[PDB]
Amino acid sequence: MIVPVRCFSCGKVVGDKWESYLNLLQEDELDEGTALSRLGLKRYCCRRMILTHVDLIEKFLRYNP
Template sequence: MIIPVRCFTCGKVIGNKWDHYLDLLQADYSEGDALDALGLVRYCCRRMLMTHVDLIEKLLNYNSNPSLSLFFLFCSFMLELFDCL
């Protein structure tokens, strides 16, 4: 699944922070420090990023149909493209 665009509880936009969150985690930030750096102070918004599981990447590992795999990659590319607009 892709990260929801808004927090389910308060409605704050969080969908644009997912890639930055992953970049900060790879730069050896702790989860709390990364969320603080992104300006997420409400625990409901923090929960949305900390508990998100990227299921599309996990499902692609078990796909036996290569054309379906390409379809998922195309869909994820289009989602990233529209997210940048």
């Protein structure tokens, strides 16, 4: 359910990195690890944030009203 703003552990803004990550995976066709590092997510607390996120909102938006 939607990309968290900021990493719970440290605070680095991650809420602006999602769409960018998705283009890096789909359009650039790179692997998650190189995708995360290209966005500038050096620490593993910041890595799990995006890598471990499930974007349930896309499914929720499918609900008619």
